[PDB]
Symmetry: D3
Subunit: 310 residues, 6 copies
């Protein structure tokens, strides 16, 4: 899918930009926002076409509160604000955001330029509340040092997991995306042995091999994020996480971004992580990662995006 | 689409070759030409397989006259010669061409070698009437200094814009292509300010952002080439333009090549450019660009191409 | 088309690994084999994800006999062990193989690592009988010096040639693959003149242009491997051949690997090559190439593969 | 120069990291800092070897004050703190910095990982006071839209311009570097015409051709930064400038970083920019660019660095 | 040597531009020419710096007649016009040229742009008389289908062969370059068998292996271009030949460009090719290649180039 | 630094070929060997020129014994056959080799082709005794999973460490190279914990950071291979190690290849490794790595090489 908005299914990239903005109160602000996002293919090609490879992509997401301001009588079945979670020691807050731009490219400058053109076009109609510059870290590792993104669905399976189909045909081809900006405690993580780290995650560190059943803790990240229903059907999500950080402020981070045809799946994964299964048996990754943001957005198909609102 | 003839929807390339040929009078010349173009996947794979990336593509176009020589029993709905335009200031000539080979690859040698093999195979049966060696110029620019090709439809919109469908099912998967070789008057172009040039085109020069509606002149290139039907639906074409030139002859050029499921879209862009909308309000880009060729070809699907 | 097993239609790669294995007679062994191959997308992603480009692929093949050990019924319409051939001068041996792993990537390391993880996971349950490290040789050439793989089908023509369709619907999207590890007689080939070699293959050497119909020997590799049915319709296979070799053992090989929706096409090609058409008029490529292995496998669709057992 | 510390003459890179640090008061802080920087080839190889291409480089700079703390017995001839400038309209502040790490690589992760390892190794002994993540912007442009770095000396001229030689043989192979973090007023810049901007810079915008002598304003950036001695010999510096910014904070920046065997060349460029030549005739580029930092460091040769 | 004029020793490139121009009669034309070529590092960096790799190079050459117009009292020891040669069937003409720009890059656009800027700067002061767009053809082959450039000297040996040293220290670091634009007769070449072609050249076609002594004809291209003196010292030149052509005009070509510290070596090679050794035993490549141009230029070191004239 | 033989100082490559040969006792054989190796720049350019990047290199090594057959006097100051070692637990065998071809390139095909042309040109005059196909493994790692080659000297430090200088002026620009083909015990290595492996090597595994002085075992590979003379001056070698292996034979190797201007440094490292410092305190890398070959060669400068015989 070359230079087309809402290409949710793009392969991993060397660089990414995650921009979360809050729309202004007024009807003017609301219309400018609609004009920019509905014509997003403009900037996308304006920038992307300058690179022969055409690696630039941009996925627009819209929050529940803003959606109801521009499309009151027509709504995707599962659009609602991020559901906050409160475990005994770790919490997943719900933080503001009306707009997500999830930008990917083979180069930083491409992501920066598109972001620059998008922010410029929005002007005073919206305010950036979160901005993260993602980058590939060695052989697809996260800053905890583990290969990150492995078990992502691909092919037909990626389409099945991520994109709305017959269940909500008015919004077929859309998706739901949840973001959380995680910051790690590197000191504490480094006090663990590699083997203990492998138990937290559920895979070997260097070689990235899944631990067998008999050595795989019931609270391992992989175990808790494996969703099987009563029918025995596996439910998967599509992740585009990227490393980010700042040496001077001592921030080493993982940006979580997960797409699903039904946010119920992602929410369940989160419930199992923060609250545990069985209860209290929570994901130990959370001892070393703290979510600073939590926002859900609806990702409209192109046809629906181009219609807003107008 | 890997090494398949008539791959109309290929992305941009670093290099291209546009070859226009006129076929000979004789029944033998006609048969050779048909033998060569119907088996075009041979040379295509013979060279293209030699590159790991497999970037090589070749689209064959056939002119109206030549088609009538080989298939008088059925005709694509819109196949006719290129229509000349005579405007208030500028004109678009209709020039000869029975065959088009639109060749694209990541490297010159691939384009050149495919062209070599095609011309050798055709021998005395056809003559090259136009030959242009296209090349990418920095970040997708044309020699006027502007990013060129930006608003090309992509993906589904691209197939919808370019590929023949239910409206003419006998030639489903085919397309129509129009070529014009433009030469630029560079010194004249350079006497304009950047702002003047931006108003001629419709976009900012370095940053390639569309001018807002209220700074967009009604005769801007972008404005005249925006085709909107009465139900408000835009109609787009697929452009594969490349820079070319010769320093010794002071040629600095843009090869125009546009594909559409219905050439009337492209033709209307041309009329609106050359004659103006409203009439008189012609495309200033034509004050700095002169077409030395103008030819329309039908682009058969693989199936149809293979049966010729 | 990224990091999904049974991706038959992948484009040529710079590196290859061809692993052929026989399985243990044990029941523990059968089960292990099934766990490994049914969950093959695990290792494939474990390795492949580490490369940004995602060039790594792995096609799993299962031999006729081992297939019967894990699928009583059902069975694919044309699954059977490799038919050996005994021709006037040259012979195609049918050699053992229960499992094929056809691995391709842009790098050696990715191939080797994936293979290492597959071999480790199988442990004692299976044994390697043939291991070939394939590599791209200059501009897609084999060690005989000719461009190799040129006339391969592409796009929809490739899918139609290689993938089981409406005609065997329980196994739709599967394929049949035949391998033969050919070793070459270099010095004998070198005594031919370029023009003689061109007669043998059916195409010009440097330029890879197909010889004229009137200059085309009736026993040229190309003509022998051209299949046209009675209605005039051509039938093609998908080749993924790679060069391999060893300098000290003086081994110089082409690894043949061909996929079809029906091995009837491949087997006919092999007959025309080894027996000849007319009989005795065999493929001269065989005078300089000797097959050291010969094994047929069924390539299950992704769904079929994941369901064992 | 492959993975050697103090490789001053490296070509441009897709990515960079500029880290400025102030060292702590204590004798222990001083020893840790010295241990880290004297063994800098460890982290450098520890990360850099992991990339086949070996694009990773790291240059260490030491400020005047910190140097006096570690080597009071000998001093490079021109080491002093950065001199503040107060001009008619604009000023260049002198801001703190004991250590500079100028890191370049083909990839962000390499720069980041080296920076991570250096900061971890330094621990409580030093504090990061400035951190900028530089990136190439299209075809070597800065965020003002101009090709930036064009007239850098190369090869022998580069070593002659940047490396200390016979004039100070105790520190042969060393250099002097000045950094300034510039932030741009983009909306103001955009109210100029392209022609106006070209006159501010001294070169045409898209094509990066020097303006002829008679269209060159006497206060153009290029004009003011051309240093010619009384025998007519030009004196050049080596620039490694990179774009940077933050969309949320509306920061759009150019990190200035310039190397010279004698910082007085660079300093004179700065005075001619900030105060003007003649006085009052200051660099208009400063009407759109504001320096938030200004720091001078000495760049020791490997030998000297390793002995600290 | 990054983005520096007169880098004679550059490695092979995917693209090249050879421009040969004739300077105008007048003192004005003469000064403009001097101003452009002496400041050539300007355009070179103006263009080259826009490509991260920095693959662009430009070597300026100056003909004998023009040299004497701008530097009458100071002259490289061996600067003279191209010496024409007349064999019984094949001839090497001497054709005009005051200026050579030999431009190389990884991309066409870079070579084109620099050429464009050079021609623009020269204006009416000079006229292009030859222009060739060179391109790599597969694995460094020429259009005759043979690997071309193999036996080029590299390292110290390239410097020793190509660049003026102590023998003429006023011009140390300069070189002498000869160009000939050859057009091939592909029909005639294709009537030969591969083996006969291998005998013409002196190397195997596909594998590019030198034929052994006992199967190597005394008139093979390789034999005739092997220069050994009485002392037994081999003398080599540095070649940067490139394919070029035009399908419509049926031109398939090899552009010869050879650099040497003393053009005597190149001239001897040419004498042996066109006249034979022994006499009449000429280079059979010439049955299939016809020189349309022949011009010698002096290539000044940077310091000398920057001094002209002024 | 392009397509010139005896380019010792080349950077790491994606592919390697290590060819070790013994020469015939014949005089015809001696002469052929000399013609091939003295004119090695021929094949090197014949192959290397076909790649735009020019990544192909070839270093020719000549064993002590064969050297004596073609150079009566002169002789390099420190040329001698590989000194074998017999340590408390582990042993370094000294194995045959007259010729070493150390070939590196960005592609396999370039390596293989060059090697094929060298073997063909030598014909009966020599025989391959060891052939290793080296490859880059992920981010410059060996099969033990550690970054391998990190502390290699660079720039002038590399030239000074590896190239013969003023001290043996007839052979200035030459080098001495030692090879050992190590095979690993993977499953034994895998029973160690990451932290134990880190103790064995001397560096962190993922991040490749050198362990603190106070956490550094006195028998860690790093400490054992650190050479500091009596005046305090460090002495380094240049390593070009590559991974190799075979899945079916269960071979997982590191090919050691180290260049020094004086093999005294390399041999001391080898002693500290095999014998230990103090004695018995040997390199634990040796508990999981066994050398199957061991051979020293002189690397002549380009001038010296071209002058045989
Ligand atoms: C004659 C030389 C020409 C030059 C130098 C030129 C240049 C440009 C440029 C710079 C753009 C803006 C970037 C883009 O979206 O592609 C553009 C757009 C476009 N041009 Fe041209 N053009 C030329 C001829 C033509 C012709 C003959 C046609 C139609 C037959 C044409 C049709 C279009 C269309 C359809 C667009 C996109 C408009 C939109 O939907 O925004 N151009 N051209
Ligand atoms: C000794 C091992 C072999 C070598 C060296 C070899 C070589 C070649 C070459 C050089 C070509 C021409 C380029 C191309 O179109 O791919 C070719 C074509 C072909 N070969 Fe092979 N081949 C070998 C074995 C086989 C076998 C065993 C089969 C069938 C089982 C086979 C089937 C084909 C087919 C179907 C084509 C395409 C023919 C066409 O339609 O033009 N090859 N082979
Ligand atoms: C403040 C932000 C700056 C911007 C946006 C900027 C931009 C530019 C540009 C576009 C050029 C022309 C291309 C080139 O040759 O590099 C240039 C040239 C140059 N600049 Fe800057 N510059 C800045 C600051 C500085 C400073 C502070 C200095 C000196 C301390 C400086 C020294 C130079 C020099 C020496 C040249 C080359 C002049 C010549 O010899 O032709 N620049 N700059
Ligand atoms: C079993 C085969 C070997 C393996 C797997 C191995 C592995 C390693 C590793 C992982 C490193 C650390 C990264 C680096 O700096 O390169 C290293 C360093 C080193 N190794 Fe080896 N090595 C092997 C054999 C040898 C041998 C036989 C020698 C000497 C003859 C040797 C000498 C060195 C040296 C000199 C260093 C750099 C030490 C330093 O100064 O920090 N290695 N090796
Ligand atoms: Cl960004
Ligand atoms: Cl071409
Ligand atoms: Cl492998
Ligand atoms: Cl960074
Ligand atoms: Cl050009
Ligand atoms: Cl090899």
């Amino acid at each position: 899918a070359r230079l087309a908005p809402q290409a949710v299914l793009t392969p991993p990239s060397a660089a990414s930009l995650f921009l979360v903005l809050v729309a202004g109160d007024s009807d003017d602000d609301r219309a400018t926002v609609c004009d920019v996002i509905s014509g997003i293919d403009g900037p996308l090609k304006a920038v992307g076409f300058r690179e022969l490879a055409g690696s630039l992509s941009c996925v627009v997401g819209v929050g529940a509160q803003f959606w109801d301001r521009v499309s009151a009588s027509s709504k995707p079945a599962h659009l609602h604000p991020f559901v906050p979670l409160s475990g005994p020691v770790h919490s997943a807050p719900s933080t503001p955001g009306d707009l997500l731009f999830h930008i990917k490219a083979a180069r930083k400058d491409l992501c920066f330029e598109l972001g620059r053109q998008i922010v410029s076009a929005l002007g005073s109609a919206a305010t950036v509340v979160d901005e993260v510059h993602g980058f590939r870290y060695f052989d697809s590792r996260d800053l905890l040092g583990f290969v990150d993104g492995t078990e992502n669905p691909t092919d037909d399976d990626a389409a099945d997991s991520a994109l709305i189909g017959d269940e909500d045909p008015d919004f077929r081809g859309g998706s739901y995306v949840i973001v959380q900006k995680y910051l790690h405690d590197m000191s504490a993580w480094n006090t663990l042995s590699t083997e203990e780290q492998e138990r937290v995650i559920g895979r070997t560190k260097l070689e990235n091999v899944e631990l067998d059943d008999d050595a795989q803790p019931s609270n391992s990240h992989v175990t808790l994020n494996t969703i099987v229903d009563d029918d025995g059907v596996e439910h998967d999500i599509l992740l585009d996480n990227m490393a980010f950080g700042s040496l001077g402020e001592a921030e080493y981070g993982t940006y979580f971004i997960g797409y699903a045809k039904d946010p119920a799946v992602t929410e369940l994964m989160l419930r199992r992580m923060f609250l545990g299964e069985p209860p209290g048996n929570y994901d130990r990754v959370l001892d070393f990662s703290t979510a600073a943001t939590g926002t859900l957005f609806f990702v409209p198909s192109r046809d629906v995006l181009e219609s807003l609102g107008d």
